[PDB]
Amino acid sequence: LNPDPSQ
Amino acid sequence: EVQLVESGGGLVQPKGSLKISCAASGFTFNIYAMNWVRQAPGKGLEWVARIRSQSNNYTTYYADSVKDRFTISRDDSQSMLYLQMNNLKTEDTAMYYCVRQMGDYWGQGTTLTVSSAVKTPPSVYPLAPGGGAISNSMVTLGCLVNGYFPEPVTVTWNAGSLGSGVHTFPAVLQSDLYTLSSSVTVPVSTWPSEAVTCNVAHPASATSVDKAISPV
Amino acid sequence: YIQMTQSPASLSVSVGETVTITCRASENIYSFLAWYQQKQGKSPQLLVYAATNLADGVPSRFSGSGSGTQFSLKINSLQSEDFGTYYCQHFWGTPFTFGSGTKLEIKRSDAAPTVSIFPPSAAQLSSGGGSVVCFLNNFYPKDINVKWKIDGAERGNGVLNSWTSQDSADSTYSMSSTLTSGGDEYERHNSYTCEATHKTSTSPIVKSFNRAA
Ligand SMILES: *[C@@H]1O[C@H](CO)[C@@H](O[C@@H]2O[C@H](CO)[C@@H](O[C@@H]3O[C@H](CO)[C@@H](O)[C@H](O[C@H]4O[C@H](CO)[C@@H](O)[C@H](O)[C@@H]4O)[C@@H]3O)[C@H](O)[C@H]2NC(C)=O)[C@H](O)[C@H]1NC(C)=O
């Protein structure tokens, strides 16, 4: 569930 | 499970440097964004800094009050997160948290104390009842702990046998020195018929004191 | 920078009662918001992520709702364990700022304090020190008045008080009061009194000792 979200 | 263990925190002279650490395990560290969050004693949570994963070029974010002064980094090879803190100020005194991604897991915290006050062992006193005319089957006893720096201290009763009836009070500063009392309630059958001792520890000054409470 | 203003600062709440803590964002933060519950002495724990999603190992009574600008956490039939401080955080652009906090207390029936007085320790006298300690134990509600009396004459000098956080067991409060005097100043009197006045009574609880006795 997204470890490093880019927005 | 997922775990983040913080370390490295302690007393640092203002205008000094410290490098606090965060060890990660139970999850794929190198794919997660990581951040640090701080909490000054009694105050609310303040976000400090963040770092993205290798795949996103390790791009970093900081808070205005901490920028140019704190540098967040990570060793992916060892699953470690760091915070280099240079030119520390008084308002940087806090519990520092290592938080994963957007906040699903937090570590337990290390304390940072920025102060020019000197490390001092406490004076431990037994608190025994006085005057007389007892209006309770349970008698309350205590231990006063006077003049110590820095926090924290650890008070327990009878090697840990007395789990309940025990109130450990916060602490207060007056002249760069801390002071707290602890209270314990035991039956009259229990005392002085048994030996009720308090176990004061002060990790910093390497002090360990055990005081029995004696009838006056 | 986006400011989050939390309301209310503090809540006093009976078990089984339902409560709603709200959080408003200065600008549109969409759904990038989380709710945390912290307990005193412990680290925060994630309650809701993305404004409306219940996190693992969090009871169903915790309801997250909202999008855009106005968010609110809702607790259904608050259980004794739900005591603590509740924080919100947004994550729409650095810095990810927090709410100011909501302090949540358990509502409980009234209870009078159990007062104990203590003479300066024998060890502290061999040190030139005179501290008089008074314990006020297991009362509710939180606010409580302490007055000191030395030889009948009332003191308001070197008294410092510490309260405890509401404990998990009986939901009560405790407080210590400490008169720290000259050490030489102590031997110039003998009658020592600790006066506690609490909601539960107009008659102050008096506990006292004589030094020369
Ligand atoms: C994190 O940073 C890294 C390293 O900088 C970065 O890796 C690379 O991405 C960039 C694109 O952002 C790549 O650069 C391109 O390379 C291609 C293929 O060789 C070129 O055709 C492109 O040329 C254009 O731009 C030039 C000017 O810069 C012009 O001269 C030209 O006319 C074109 O318009 C472009 O330069 C680079 O090749 C890769 N390298 C790797 C290691 O793959 C990465 O993008 C960053 N990560 C993230 C998530 O942003």
Residue numbers in the entry:
A (entry chain P): 44 to 50
B (entry chain H): 1 to 216
C (entry chain L): 1 to 213
Please share excerpts from the published article on this structure:
Recently, we have developed a novel murine anti-osteopontin mAb, namely, 23C3, which is of great potential in treatment of RA. Intriguingly, 23C3 recognizes a distinct epitope motif (43WLNPDP48) of the full-length osteopontin, which may account for the differences. The Fab fragment displays a canonical Fab structure with four immunoglobulin domains of VL, CL, VH, and CH1. The complementarity-determining region (CDR) loops L1, L2, L3, H1, and H2 belong to Chothia canonical classes 2, 1, 1, 1, and 4, respectively.
To further validate the critical roles of TrpP43 and AspP47 in the binding of 23C3, we carried out structural studies of the 23C3 Fab in complexes with the mutant peptides containing single mutation W43A or D47A, or double mutations W43A/D47A. The crystal structure of the 23C3 Fab in complex with the W43A mutant peptide was determined at 2.8 Å resolution with an R−factor of 24.1% and a free R−factor of 29.7%. The structure of the mutant complex resembles that of the wild-type peptide complex. Superposition of the two complexes yields an RMSD of 0.4 Å for 436 aligned Cα atoms. In this mutant peptide complex, only seven (LeuP44 to GlnP50) of the nine peptide residues (ThrP42 to GlnP50) observed in the wild-type peptide complex could be defined with clear electron density and the two N-terminal residues ThrP42 and AlaP43 are disordered, indicating that the binding of this region with the Fab is substantially impaired due to the loss of the hydrophobic interactions caused by the W43A mutation. Moreover, crystallization of the 23C3 Fab in complex with the D47A or W43A/D47A mutant peptide was unsuccessful so far. It is most likely that the D47A mutation of the peptide would disrupt the extensive hydrophilic interactions of the peptide with the Fab and lead to the loss of the peptide's ability to bind the Fab.
